Amino acid sequence: TGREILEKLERREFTREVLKEALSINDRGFNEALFKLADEIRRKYVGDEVHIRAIIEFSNVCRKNCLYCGLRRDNKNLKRYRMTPEEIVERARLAVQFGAKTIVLQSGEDPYXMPDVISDIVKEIKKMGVAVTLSLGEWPREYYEKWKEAGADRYLLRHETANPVLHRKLRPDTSFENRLNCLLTLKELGYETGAGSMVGLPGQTIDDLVDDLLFLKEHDFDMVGIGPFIPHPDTPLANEKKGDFTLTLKMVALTRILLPDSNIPATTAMGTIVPGGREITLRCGANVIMPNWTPSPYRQLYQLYPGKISVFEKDTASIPSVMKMIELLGRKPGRDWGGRKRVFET
Numbered sequence: 001t002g003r004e005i006l007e008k009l010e011r012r013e014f015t016r017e018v019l020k021e022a023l024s025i026n027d028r029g030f031n032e033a034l035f036k037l038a039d040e041i042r043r044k045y046v047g048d049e050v051h052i053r054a055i056i057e058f059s060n061v062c063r064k065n066c067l068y069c070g071l072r073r074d075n076k077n078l079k080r081y082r083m084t085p086e087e088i089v090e091r092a093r094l095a096v097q098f099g100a101k102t103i104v105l106q107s108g109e110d111p112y113x114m115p116d117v118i119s120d121i122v123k124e125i126k127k128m129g130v131a132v133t134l135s136l137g138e139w140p141r142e143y144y145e146k147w148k149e150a151g152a153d154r155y156l157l158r159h160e161t162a163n164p165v166l167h168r169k170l171r172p173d174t175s176f177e178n179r180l181n182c183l184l185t186l187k188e189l190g191y192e193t194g195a196g197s198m199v200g201l202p203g204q205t206i207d208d209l210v211d212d213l214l215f216l217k218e219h220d221f222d223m224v225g226i227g228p229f230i231p232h233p234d235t236p237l238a239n240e241k242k243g244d245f246t247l248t249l250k251m252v253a254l255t256r257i258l259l260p261d262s263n264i265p266a267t268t269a270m271g272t273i274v275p276g277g278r279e280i281t282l283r284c285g286a287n288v289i290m291p292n293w294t295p296s297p298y299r300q301l302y303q304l305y306p307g308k309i310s311v312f313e314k315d316t317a318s319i320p321s322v323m324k325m326i327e328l329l330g331r332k333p334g335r336d337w338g339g340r341k342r343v344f345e346t
Ligand SMILES: C[C@H](CCC(=O)NCCC[N+](C)(C)CCCS(=O)(=O)[O-])[C@H]1CC[C@H]2[C@@H]3[C@H](O)C[C@@H]4C[C@H](O)CC[C@]4(C)[C@H]3C[C@H](O)[C@]12C
Pocket: 031, 032, 033, 035, 036, 037, 039, 040, 280, 283, 284
């Protein structure tokens, strides 16, 4: 019964069978109660502040060929771009002027920058007195070490799927073992480390989603980014089904229940598949939002998936828009860098 599963989640009996049953029950009453539980856990543990991370997608060049991603190297039907270091630093400064207290630098796996141009950019942004998060993919230990010495605070490296077989099929340049090794290296180097997965990948099962949740709980990640798979027409997965919004929202809710003190974004992908999806997600366990701060004319070229929101407006609209969102949700903007604030428990 749904009531017994909720009771077990409330008492922290996080077994495989409790998680499977939570993800398998489709009853509206149960789902609503689950979302209420996650919302309440979020409020009790991380409060009403919603942390704003301004994202600059500074290059859409990529050396990898992931089957799901519109930036894959085999996609010839995409104009490739690279922002200059000066452009990236000055765009970061504009975000800080607008009130961002974290800058996220995200790109394809673009060799050009690596490692020294990134280090130089990071040092300049750090002078502005904000947190810096990198989301650049898989690189050698030495690059991660350089970037930590340069001052980077956090690294986002979604694990994508914790099924090694599926991982290798979808990401044929690499492996789950490599992805995990990168995540473990990032943790050892002292980064606040983010992981997370897509929901609704072709071939992915409910038991695979359970394994994503257990993986996340095992490693105690500081941040967890979850969204639906969204098929991209210039990829091998073009004709596959999009991930289900409700199922993905349940994964976000369970992540908060499992990791009550973690930082969990309401991802752009959630707002792409359903109008108002980020707002829903902020009320079902999430406590972070990542407004797009990539300048025109580049923003519209960072086409990981189609239909991405925030492209038709002026490039400075997103930070004000999320501040309005936070207010209409009855929430508060973050007052500090929004680093993880651990609550040690039993
Ligand atoms: C806004 C809509 C519809 C509410 C509604 O329209 N209900 C009838 C009127 C009720 N009023 C009290 C305003 C008047 C009553 C007198 S009246 O004479 O109208 O009947 C309600 C219906 C179900 C609600 C969600 C679920 O909980 C799950 C979840 C829990 C989290 O924690 C917060 C997020 C989330 C997604 C919820 C958000 C929101 O809250 C929802 C969509």
